[PDB]
Amino acid sequence: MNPIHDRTSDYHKYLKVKQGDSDLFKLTVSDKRYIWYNPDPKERDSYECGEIVSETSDSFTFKTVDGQDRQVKKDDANQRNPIKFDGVEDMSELSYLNEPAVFHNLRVRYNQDLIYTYSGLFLVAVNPFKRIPIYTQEMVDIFKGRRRNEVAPHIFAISDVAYRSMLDDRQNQSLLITGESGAGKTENTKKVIQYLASVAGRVLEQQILQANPILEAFGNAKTTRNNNSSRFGKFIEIQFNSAGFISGASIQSYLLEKSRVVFQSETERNYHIFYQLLAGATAEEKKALHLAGPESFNYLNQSGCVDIKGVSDSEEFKITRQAMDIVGFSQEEQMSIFKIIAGILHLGNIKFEKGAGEGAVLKDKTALNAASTVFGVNPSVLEKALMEPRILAGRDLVAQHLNVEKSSSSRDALVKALYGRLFLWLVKKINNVLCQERKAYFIGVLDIEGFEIFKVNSFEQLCINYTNEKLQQFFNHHMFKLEQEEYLKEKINWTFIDFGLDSQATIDLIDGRQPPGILALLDEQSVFPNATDNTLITKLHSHFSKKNAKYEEPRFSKTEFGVTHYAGQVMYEIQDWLEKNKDPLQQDLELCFKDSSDNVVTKLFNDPNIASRAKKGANFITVAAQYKEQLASLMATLETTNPHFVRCIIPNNKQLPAKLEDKVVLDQLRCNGVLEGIRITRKGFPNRIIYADFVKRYDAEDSQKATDAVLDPEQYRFGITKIFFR
């Protein structure tokens, strides 16, 4: 039996809507009509189903749940779809396309663990927050080669469609997986990669998969929104030869959240690797590295959280090391990696105290000595580099004597540099292993850090949210703007629709050059010798307050500014932004570590690709300018691919299964442009081929006549160089 047609198969059990019973059939053939309405008009996302009992020319009257009777204009009415549509696999098929109707369909599917639903040309994936057995090899095998309409919605299906388009069109593809923090981007990314590796595979393929536990160990952490939050964005190029077999892969990582190494908010964790090393190391290795439990380290004992429900850090450590072995990190390199992790922990335990004067001293040198031992550096040199770094004053060489706060910050800067550089080094090592062939093609899978809002939002959140805004605009541009520009250019008699989705004003507020946006004003302040966080916020207010519609100068704070993003307004706290943008590290610290006896540490400080910083005239390039440039480069790459969108949707903000919260979901459906995306797919003309190229596949001087002969008139329209189909 073909599992697709076998109602006993796991495919049918886990990916198809369950058979309705005879009572549902009765309800399904009912002549009655229903409407979605709000019992409480202030709560616009909480809906009940009311029966339409009467109508006028312009209105419906319906019975509420409590049994009263309401009236509503037909043009304002959210009619409920005939219930034969409940659970439908592609929501472009719905008769009534409205918010409660789309949400209801997602809910019916979600309630039976069907997390994937097509919304026209793109896939919607609602996080189940539990394991559903739909990602086995057997599932992979079922989707292999199948057209999207032959099989159930699945991340595997869109992956296969991209793979088939790559071969059929000889064009690079991308899979763009959007979603707010914890929505499921990383999980789905991993599934796309699993699938491509299996269907296009011929050890290389295993190394591709095993890159993930490494990067997640060093790059992921518990935040309040996601127990396994990615703290770096990544674009994975899965590379193929001309025959369509996997030839390699390349990982581009984007800015890692280095600040997490030295500070975590309440209930959050540092990067997983710290907890994995401490829980998972042998008592031998804990002695050589001078390690104890998490509670003995300032960098791990501030949040009040050292464990994650359902996660064994010692077991994860074993998975991380196995991945490192498979990828090819030597035992030497692995030990050096954990020396750096241990050393960072020790550096964090250094306690600076006030000396006779304003300058800091280090009374207890235990932590300094353990760090220096594991890194292979001179402790006296390190001590002097932390508290008495030398700088130029003009051309004179002057020993500073940093006070306690500056010493502690410099120490943090060293830590963040060590961690950030190690991460870049891990990625580079992985890439060199996965770089074995010049590619013919690639499918690029984008997994950015998801849109996030916390009590305190800093520069890191602005960068993340800016990226999410840019990705949403990329969706807007491809689904709506480019689409409609093609229709109108080809004169298929298209009436332009304003879909009301445009993130450009927010993007410009952030990254504008002329007039200067936030990032540009930040950069200018960053190289202005007398700038402070206060002159910076004042500068932002001066440029944007009551001037830019997406900016708010709050009345309740002098140190925050609000950006209205697609996903909601975010208040950003300016504290430390100049320093975060400059990302300073005392040169004496680099000089100390350049002399490291450790082969990995020495690479982190001597390899120009890792250690060197690009210059913009008399200054180093800022974090913001670099960020902006890497993102612009990503977007340019994406523009050369055929994109496929997966919209991950989080069901609630508690990381709980079986708990769709309608306001949480509806906010995402709205700001993602899901309904608008379904509408363009229904009302528009998805596919078009130049007439001459259509005739040759299905020669003539009058290529249009040949096209009409071969051809229902409604499902097509003749353009000036192309035929258009539905």
Ligand SMILES: Nc1ncnc2c1ncn2[C@@H]1O[C@H](COP(=O)(O)OP(=O)(O)O)[C@@H](O)[C@H]1O
């Ligand atoms: N399809 C899924 N199946 C099972 N768990 C999932 C699935 N998608 C999301 N997860 C759950 O939600 C968590 C957060 O998802 P993740 O992909 O890490 O978020 P992000 O969108 O921030 O990358 C996962 O660690 C897992 O617990």
Ligand code: ALF
């Ligand atoms: F926690 Al994420 F994308 F990994 F928002």
Ligand SMILES: [Mg+2]
């Ligand atoms: Mg992630």
